[PDB]
Design a protein around this nucleic acid. Sequence first.
DNA 1: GACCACGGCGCC
DNA 2: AAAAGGCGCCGTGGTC
Length: 539
Amino acid sequence: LEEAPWPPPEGAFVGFVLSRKEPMWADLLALAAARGGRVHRAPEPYKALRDLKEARGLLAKDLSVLALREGLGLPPGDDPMLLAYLLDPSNTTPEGVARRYGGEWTEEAGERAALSERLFANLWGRLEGEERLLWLYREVERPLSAVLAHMEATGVRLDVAYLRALSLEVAEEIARLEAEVFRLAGHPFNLNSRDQLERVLFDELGLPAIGKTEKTGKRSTSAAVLEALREAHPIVEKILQYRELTKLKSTYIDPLPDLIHPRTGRLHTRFNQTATATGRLSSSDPNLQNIPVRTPLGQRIRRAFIAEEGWLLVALDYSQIELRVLAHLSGDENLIRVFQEGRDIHTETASWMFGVPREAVDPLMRRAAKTINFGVLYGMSAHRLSQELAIPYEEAQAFIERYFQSFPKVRAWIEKTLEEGRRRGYVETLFGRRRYVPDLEARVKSVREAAERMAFNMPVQGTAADLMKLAMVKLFPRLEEMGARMLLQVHDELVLEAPKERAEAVARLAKEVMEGVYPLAVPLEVEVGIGEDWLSAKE
DNA sequence: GACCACGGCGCC
DNA sequence: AAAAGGCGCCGTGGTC
Ligand SMILES: O=C(CCCCCCCCCO)NCCCC#Cc1cn([C@H]2C[C@H](O)[C@@H](COP(=O)(O)OP(=O)(O)OP(=O)(O)O)O2)c(=O)[nH]c1=O
Ligand SMILES: [Mg+2]
Ligand SMILES: [Mg+2]
Ligand SMILES: [Mg+2]
Ligand SMILES: [Mg+2]
Ligand SMILES: [Mg+2]
Ligand SMILES: [Mg+2]
């Protein structure tokens, strides 16, 4: 390309280099643009940002997030990553996409701009005739990138002082647990080392091995194995308690307060748009899609996520979402009827599990039932189910039979999906998002059957993901108009922040947008809560 | 200081 | 651990 002075003309493709991967934390080291046989390199990258109308190119959203951080309204536009991801969701990195579709991801901005331009050309050509993938690009992925940029640049408020205090309390309880473990072992060792713990449990103490690890075949010390050993030795329960506390402390309580941004005073995640095999988003640096909520300490941590002074959090969560999607995809009359009548399969399963009437089912019990309901749907074994429920194998086997007997057209949809997947090489969501699964034709049964579970899960999980993405794209401009903010997405949940005076109105509108996004053969229902913290907003 | 593979585990 | 699926981050162990 012919070198030309900055600035580029409108429509140019951008290339940029960051000091680190996270756009909220990165220094913009270089900026360039390419169009019409020319490359334009910016002498001063930050000032040069002001010249662009949109970020068009590889990782466009990251540049937009940095621009928004700097107080510039620079929206992301075309991004070859999104085109590539729609063609094949194994396309997740610019290194891989570049190699596959015509170039090399280097560390120079001008080369990145040139690459973006030519990749766009080639990938756009590949989507010619792919009407359904093109619809996803234009109606979902491209506009969603703009929404995600705003979410990333906004961040969420965290009660740092509360977490710092919590750390000190948890540290004292961890000390009590570890001291007991070492007493019971008869000697100290590194309790954080599963290799050292394996030797203590299975060699030094008398305990029976229950299972083996996947890659290296060591005797497992997983929570599932320890659960099976609860009655065998007092050290086991102490280890389980130690694990719960150290997991929460090392992953959330200690690291999060150190990640507050100096300018915004908030915690900023990244929402990765080309990261999963099914079309789900992922969240990283830090992951805010796995904040604890199940246990009492986990709940205390979730309460640290709070609204800005004068604002409230609004949390919205699709009810039984993958079951509703399954009803639509499979067309099972019984399942469709369940949702037309307003029943709750999670509450029903929970009633059976704990042997209590539906009115007696508490939230933790219902959570337990969700694990069981989705476990069974996506192929859990009777053995595993029997162990997790602590019921005889025969009882677990029976539950699985009746589960599918109740909804007969589900297994037929699974078989049809797998057969088409074998022929075409891919399975697809309602909207035509594809996942390639070549191991459907594997000659090794365990491999093939694992592939089958991945394959029939994808249309369900992916359709639910598509629906949420479409809802975000529709909702965002409405929130902007009301002065509200979209903060987080957690798969089938959104967390918004609204001025107190408008929170009730925002909650109502968001619920309606989400429920009416793309009507199915069954109603979509959305549960909504409002609160000063994330935990209180979900109750 | 960094990378990796692994086991393990937090969420959906 | 066991025939649930989908993620990212932890510390360990080993290395570079
Ligand atoms: O926390 C637990 C275990 C509970 C404790 C175990 C027993 C304790 C008993 C104590 C008695 O005193 N389970 C986790 C629950 C959260 C979950 C989940 C999953 C979700 N999905 C998919 C399917 C689901 O539709 C979608 C969104 O998840 P949710 O929003 O949580 O589920 P939902 O939309 O189906 O139901 P809901 O929103 O109406 O609650 O993600 C899965 O595929 N697998 C899961 O395990
Ligand atoms: Mg839900
Ligand atoms: Mg949810
Ligand atoms: Mg209104
Ligand atoms: Mg190891
Ligand atoms: Mg792993
Ligand atoms: Mg699981």
